[PDB]
Amino acid sequence: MKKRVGIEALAVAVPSRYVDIEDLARARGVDPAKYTAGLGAREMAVTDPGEDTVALAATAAARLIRQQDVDPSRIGMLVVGTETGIDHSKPVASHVQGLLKLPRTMRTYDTQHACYGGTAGLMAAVEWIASGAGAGKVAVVVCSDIARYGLNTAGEPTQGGGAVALLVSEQPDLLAMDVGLNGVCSMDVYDFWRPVGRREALVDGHYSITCYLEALSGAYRGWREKALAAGLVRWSDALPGEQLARIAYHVPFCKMARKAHTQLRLCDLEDAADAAASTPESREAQAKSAASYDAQVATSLGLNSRIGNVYTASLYLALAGLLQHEAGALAGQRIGLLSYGSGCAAEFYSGTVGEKAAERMAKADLEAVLARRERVSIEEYERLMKLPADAPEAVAPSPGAFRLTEIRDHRRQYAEGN
Amino acid sequence: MKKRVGIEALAVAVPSRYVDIEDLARARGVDPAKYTAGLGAREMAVTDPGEDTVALAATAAARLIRQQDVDPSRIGMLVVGTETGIDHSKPVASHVQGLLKLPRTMRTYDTQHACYGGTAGLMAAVEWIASGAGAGKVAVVVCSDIARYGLNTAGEPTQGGGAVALLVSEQPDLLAMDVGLNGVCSMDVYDFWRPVGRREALVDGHYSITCYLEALSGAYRGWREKALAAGLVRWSDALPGEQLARIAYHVPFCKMARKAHTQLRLCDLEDAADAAASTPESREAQAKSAASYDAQVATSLGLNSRIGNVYTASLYLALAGLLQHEAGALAGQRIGLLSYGSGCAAEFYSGTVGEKAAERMAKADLEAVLARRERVSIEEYERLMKLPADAPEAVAPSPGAFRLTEIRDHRRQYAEGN
Numbered sequence A, B: 001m002k003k004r005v006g007i008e009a010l011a012v013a014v015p016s017r018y019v020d021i022e023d024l025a026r027a028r029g030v031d032p033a034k035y036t037a038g039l040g041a042r043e044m045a046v047t048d049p050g051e052d053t054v055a056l057a058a059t060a061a062a063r064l065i066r067q068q069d070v071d072p073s074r075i076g077m078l079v080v081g082t083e084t085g086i087d088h089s090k091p092v093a094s095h096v097q098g099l100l101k102l103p104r105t106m107r108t109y110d111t112q113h114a115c116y117g118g119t120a121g122l123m124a125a126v127e128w129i130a131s132g133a134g135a136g137k138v139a140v141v142v143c144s145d146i147a148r149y150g151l152n153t154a155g156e157p158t159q160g161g162g163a164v165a166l167l168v169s170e171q172p173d174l175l176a177m178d179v180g181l182n183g184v185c186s187m188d189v190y191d192f193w194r195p196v197g198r199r200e201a202l203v204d205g206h207y208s209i210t211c212y213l214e215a216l217s218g219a220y221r222g223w224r225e226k227a228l229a230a231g232l233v234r235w236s237d238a239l240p241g242e243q244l245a246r247i248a249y250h251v252p253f254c255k256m257a258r259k260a261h262t263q264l265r266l267c268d269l270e271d272a273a274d275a276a277a278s279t280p281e282s283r284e285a286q287a288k289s290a291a292s293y294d295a296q297v298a299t300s301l302g303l304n305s306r307i308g309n310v311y312t313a314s315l316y317l318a319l320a321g322l323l324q325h326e327a328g329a330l331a332g333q334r335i336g337l338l339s340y341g342s343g344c345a346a347e348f349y350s351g352t353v354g355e356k357a358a359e360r361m362a363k364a365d366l367e368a369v370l371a372r373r374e375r376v377s378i379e380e381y382e383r384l385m386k387l388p389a390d391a392p393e394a395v396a397p398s399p400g401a402f403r404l405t406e407i408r409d410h411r412r413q414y415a416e417g418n
């Protein structure tokens, strides 16, 4: 009689190539430690035009269906969160439906708000099910993006690309979400944006970090109030946020997770009924606790550090990395998730990891996904960057994966790997 | 103890200018009767670059809040359905939030699937509320679009523009929606699309009509099965679809509603347990019933015929025109709605018109909205069409409305009329 809803499983797709981030530093005249220590990066996914938003989304969604033995006719919603759209009207979701040969009894659409678009679609799918409308069916929500700032830009070492496909159902083996407890904070800003007809993003980098932390603070506080009233956390000898077993954050670069966690802890320390007894110095020293970061956040960054920013998918890659190794230990425990998108909006939500989470993550076979990639030179990365969007390289997709092959008469053509 | 969810109220914004459709015919060497009788058009909204997707959406949403005395701090979701997006990352919804000076505790994002994007967002808002997550709050879903096919194209006489803002709540005075009964039908097609960097749509016009009717048939049949099982309609002396008091359809051009209604009735006639006793000729003659079209559909086209296709908003302009005059008579009666977007997806859903629907429509003051417009020449429409997107005309917005004024350093600037 206890109904549940949330994420049942996930799958990951990554571009076929990456570069070593220290190679990028040397090519840019930058100290490699700025990237490896300052940003937390190790490897950066790079793309060619054949690895477009559709190809990556379809690869991830097809992999989800195969790895988890999803019955395609049970999918009632297919949503793609992206900020790398390829048509003003025709959604990536419709291309994915066709490439996967999915049947007709489903909503299809894309959701857009920078790196928050995937979470927006996840909540639409969750609440479709939780309203009863989706009872007996599942949704697939795919976060797919290619993050491009441009050669010789400050954002360049945070680039990346890929997709995460989420299975959403009444059997949320990965994360049984606490419906209705979300905190949200949004405001109209120009921290990061990408006008139509611009291939590379515009960004005010340090301002965008301030906006992330400001929106995080509002979203987390909103969740905390509802979690307090639902009895899930208390003001005790432990801070409210310390009672979450883990917290995953949107990862534009890996060091951002430490900034975010410090800010979240500062929200508890500033808001405690006895905060007047503290100073900025004592609060910051407690908030920055290495023990808390190590216990709640550190193990969520293994995949992100090898891929880069994947915009809508970055938070879900962090969820994936966390559960990849700790799903069994986390079963029955509640964790928190912070989604941010520039523009901007943040949402903080929680859920309980399922008993079968380890099973579902084993089937995602994520080290095999990352192992199929190949390293290229910075010179080759630059050559591929300069290719127009309609000039895919002449290479076949891996088995079950997809590539854009050409655009003919304004129609995009794809190939599936044998 | 009877919980309800759906559309509480709506508001409309239209561009400041229109052309007489017979003037367009004469300028194109076309028989004006092709447009007035063949398509059902009377007046076509035309825009200048200052009437962009944001300006129209913000005008409609601000008008909703003022006309319906919405408490802005009760808005927990602001979604814009559009296929006329203006940034790859930053959503129209975030601009609308800022222009309206709305507070921070809301999700913001855009939804995309051609003319289905508004309905997708409506369902996300409805199910957010119906899941319980939105209990005590409201959503605003804005359908905003400018339909542009180009000078001397077959689609040109179906152009239009505007926005409809929907208030969604537990007090659905316009339409208490039947949660969970929706029928849906989607498939990957290239009937109509608009690649990034193309200002005008691409379309295979007659194929797009076939796709609309095919998807309508699947969506309607899906709803009908669920409505039968919920006891809302029966196979009786009346066809199932005849038991809906009215049916509103996506209106790309006004004559499309008659094609759609005929197709819906054909679905009942082909599917009746005793269909073997009929012929294509006898079914078509019954399906095309003028009495049924007059009783269920005809009064939904008054606004559409004076505006044109507004993509995501067209169905909701048809809902608006229906309730503008018949809300009191329809109170307590169930009506049907068919949303279609090219690409493609259709969804058919139903709801009951509320006792206070007439009150809410009176406050929308729709004849005043349409009366503020001015007629221009085809020559002037063509001059405005040739203006680049970053070259708004130097004209002030009407009181409470918005216009794009300029793009400076890649940042869009707006003005609010005094």
Ligand SMILES: CC(=O)CC(=O)SCCNC(=O)CCNC(=O)[C@H](O)C(C)(C)COP(=O)(O)OP(=O)(O)OC[C@H]1O[C@@H](n2cnc3c(N)ncnc32)[C@H](O)[C@@H]1OP(=O)(O)O
Residues within 6 Å of the ligand: A031, A033, A034, A035, A037, A038, A039, A115, A154, A155, A156, A157, A158, A192, A203, A204, A205, A206, A208, A209, A212, A250, A251, A252, A253, A255, A256, A309, A311, A340, A341, A342
């Ligand atoms: C974009 C989204 O996805 C949405 C969001 O999350 S917005 C928030 C995140 N924003 C982004 O990712 C925007 C895109 N990226 C950028 O604009 C830039 O990459 C950036 C602002 C993240 C950094 O660019 P930058 O100005 O060149 O680097 P800078 O801030 O000076 O240094 C970065 C770190 O490296 C440190 N560092 C520099 N050189 C170092 C060295 N030799 N050894 C060790 N550390 C070094 C710096 O001290 C700094 O550390 P802290 O953050 O701990 O203070």
Ligand SMILES: CC(=O)CC(=O)SCCNC(=O)CCNC(=O)[C@H](O)C(C)(C)COP(=O)(O)OP(=O)(O)OC[C@H]1O[C@@H](n2cnc3c(N)ncnc32)[C@H](O)[C@@H]1OP(=O)(O)O
Residues within 6 Å of the ligand: B031, B033, B034, B035, B037, B038, B039, B115, B154, B155, B156, B157, B158, B192, B203, B204, B205, B206, B208, B209, B212, B250, B251, B252, B253, B255, B256, B309, B311, B340, B341, B342
């Ligand atoms: C786009 C969306 O919003 C999503 C959708 O709904 S897709 C479905 C609708 N598709 C569109 O609107 C696409 C954009 N529009 C178009 O492509 C075109 O405008 C169109 C296909 C709708 C019509 O273009 P066309 O080929 O030039 O017109 P054509 O089909 O020959 O004639 C239209 C009607 O006018 C009639 N007609 C022509 N001349 C006439 C005259 N002198 N007197 C009376 N009637 C006349 C025709 O007989 C026809 O009537 P029927 O539909 O009842 O048979």
